[PDB]
């Protein structure tokens, strides 16, 4: 594409440096740069008019369509993508062909799976040896659910039924909070808060590589978008004492702060891949916001102390977002666009930490560039932005104890480190 992966696309079609998206100066004449970073209508309404209803703008209303909106001259068309059955002309419910979505959450000790309607709640797996589950992630194609246990300092995988529990990491993961699973490349992205690092491993833990650790102070959330090759994570207290919800390539190459305003304690992060938006909850400021992948059109979904007092983790599916709140100790439910009253999907005595929606649509299929003979890499083939690496979209990284060779595809033994 004409616009680079680490660049923002002007309406005109010119690429702009990523830090300039909300730099404070309209680098894009089109004013696309700095387009409503701050978080602070109708049709038939005739502004100062007897009968001249405001033309407003087609498909320019926050919440006009659950998905891509086709702008019509005097109306709107709420188009729904593949696998999405249109409902009421405004909502894009999933295709019944795919099984009912499952809300996988941790009550505080054990990992629970329930139907998206909330009729029943079975326990997928009970943490043993006094352990507690914190973060959840899944790979639908392989029907595997991954969860971390801070008390046991271990990371576990299990089948969707609740059998064949496997231990993937137990060496140095002392306090892993959250996980993100790259279903396309079969890679697990792990956030370790014991030493404030983000490590990426295979589904079997075969190769471990530390990706982003430049200034991590207190990482709390993580999210990956294999289709576009992006990596989103949040820190509620950096080294400089500055919370930095940041977008970076899957290999953590072009780090860039995404939100730089009203960012108290960014706890959870989830990505709406269809609408290309980032939904992050703030535990301190008590608000769940939403910006695009470039952090341009900031929208406040739910705000207010009473409604969302202390969210930790948030997951999105269709027109609904499932966010867990520590203060209310409940897996609350909210509308994707705007909700005036959170819905209590489930309540637990302990404080819930993890939440995810188990559904085939949550992980759309995409090509894996690493399928081409491990991307020609001697070691870990890490996906990057589709545009990155001459458009190949993948990079070669070496495990611990090995160093990238001059060819950048081979791995020689390490020589010097302090």
């Amino acid at each position: 594409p004409t616009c680079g992966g680490y660049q923002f696309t002007c309406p005109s079609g010119r690429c702009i440096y990523q830090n300039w998206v909300c730099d404070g100066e309209d680098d894009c004449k089109d004013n696309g740069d700095e387009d409503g970073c701050e978080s602070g209508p109708g049709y038939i309404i005739n502004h100062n008019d007897s009968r001249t209803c405001v033309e407003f703008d087609d498909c320019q209303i926050w919440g006009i369509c659950d998905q891509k909106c086709e702008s019509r001259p005097g109306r709107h068309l709420c188009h729904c993508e593949e696998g999405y059955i249109l409902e009421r002309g405004q909502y894009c419910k999933a295709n019944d062909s795919f099984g009912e979505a499952s809300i996988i959450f941790s009550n505080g000790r054990d990992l629970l799976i329930g139907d998206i309607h909330g009729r029943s709640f079975r326990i997928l797996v009970e943490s043993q040896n006094r352990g507690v589950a914190v973060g959840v992630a899944f790979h639908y194609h392989l029907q595997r659910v991954f969860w971390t246990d801070t008390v046991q300092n271990k990371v576990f995988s299990v089948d969707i039924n609740g059998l064949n529990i496997q231990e993937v990491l137990n060496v140095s993961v002392e306090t892993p909070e959250n996980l993100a699973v790259d279903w396309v490349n079969n890679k697990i992205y792990l956030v370790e808060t014991k030493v404030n690092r983000i490590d990426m491993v295979n589904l079997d833990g075969s190769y471990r590589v530390t990706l982003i650790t430049e200034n991590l102070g207190h990482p709390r959330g993580i999210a990956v978008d294999p289709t576009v090759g992006y990596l989103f994570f949040s820190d509620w207290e950096s080294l400089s004492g500055e919370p930095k919800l940041e977008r970076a390539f899957m290999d953590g190459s072009n780090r860039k702060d995404l939100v730089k305003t009203k960012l108290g304690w960014p706890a959870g992060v989830t990505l709406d891949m269809i609408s290309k938006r980032v939904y992050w909850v703030d535990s301190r400021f008590d608000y769940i916001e939403t910006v695009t992948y470039d952090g341009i059109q900031r929208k406040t979904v739910v705000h207010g102390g009473s409604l969302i007092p202390h969210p930790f983790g948030v997951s999105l599916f269709e027109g609904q977002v499932f966010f867990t709140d520590w203060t209310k100790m409940a897996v609350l439910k909210a509308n994707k666009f705007t909700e005036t009253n959170p819905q209590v999907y489930y309540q637990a005595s302990l404080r819930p930490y993890g939440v995810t929606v188990y559904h085939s649509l949550r992980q759309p299929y995409a090509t894996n560039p690493c399928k081409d003979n491990n991307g020609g890499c001697e070691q870990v083939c890490v996906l990057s932005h589709r545009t990155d690496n001459d458009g190949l979209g993948f990079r070669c990284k070496c495990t611990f104890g090995f160093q990238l060779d001059t060819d950048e595809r081979h791995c020689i033994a390490v020589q010097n480190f302090l």
């Binding site: 006094r130 009203k262 102390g305 009473s306 520590w326 203060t327």
Partner: protein, 158 residues
């Protein structure tokens, strides 16, 4: 030494920690292979039905520490007690400061410190006010912590 229990890894440990409930020896040997007639578990080690000795902290925690469930088989009445005027009694009978009440914070585990707070749209006399956010503590006004979303605190803090 004479009073030091030898361990499989080679480390030593005072015989008090032997069966005390916690594996003071990092090889778990002090607690491993205990609970028998000769292996009398310590008072700190709450023994369960099948000689399952657990620390006294695990006496009646919510966690089913031992398979026999003796930790959960019987549990005594809690200590209701009371709290000071400044302290707020949470449902789990925990004394909590007024500023910690209604602060969008699960300050006391049960969360009753924040239960039913939306009924009032104002703020407490001892709690500052963040209209868009909450009734933060008055200490946050000039503590360098912009608790208020609007940044109402840390204003005019000369």
């Amino acid at each position: 030494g004479l009073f030091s229990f030898p361990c499989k890894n080679g480390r030593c440990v005072p015989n008090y920690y032997l069966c005390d409930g916690v594996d003071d020896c990092h090889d778990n040997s002090d607690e491993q292979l205990c609970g028998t007639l000769n292996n009398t578990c310590s008072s700190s080690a709450f023994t369960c039905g099948h000689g399952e000795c657990i620390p006294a902290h695990w006496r009646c925690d919510k966690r089913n520490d031992c398979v026999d469930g003796s930790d959960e088989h019987n549990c005594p009445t809690h200590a209701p007690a009371s709290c000071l005027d400044t302290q707020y009694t949470c449902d789990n009978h925990q004394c909590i400061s007024k500023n910690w009440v209604c602060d969008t914070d699960n300050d006391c585990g049960d969360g009753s410190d924040e239960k039913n707070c939306n009924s009032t749209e104002t703020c407490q006399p001892s709690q500052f006010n963040c209209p868009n956010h909450r009734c933060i503590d008055l200490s946050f006004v000039c503590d360098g912590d912009k608790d208020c979303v609007d940044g109402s605190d840390e204003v005019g803090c000369v």
